[PDB]
């Protein structure tokens, strides 16, 4: 599944 190195954490935007 997708890795875990994505940037800009995903918040309740």
Query: Which H, E and C letters describe 1-13, residue by residue?
Result: CCCCCCCCCCCCC
Max Cα-Cα span within the chain: 24
C-alpha 10/C-alpha 2 separation (Å) is 14
The Cα–Cα gap between 11 and 5 comes to 16
Give the pair of three-digit tokens for residue 11. 């918040």
- CA 4 – CA 1 distance, rounded (Å): 9
Upper half-sphere CA count for residue 3 (Cβ side, 13 Å): 3
C-alpha 9: how far from its chain's center? 5
Write out the two tokens for 12. 């309740």
CA distances from 1 to 4, 12, 13 (A): 9, 22, 24
Experimentally, the structure was elucidated by NMR
Distance, in Å, from the CA atom of 11 to the CA atom of 8, rounded to the nearest integer, reads 9
């Amino acid at each position: 599944i997708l890795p875990w190195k994505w940037p800009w954490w995903p918040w309740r935007r």
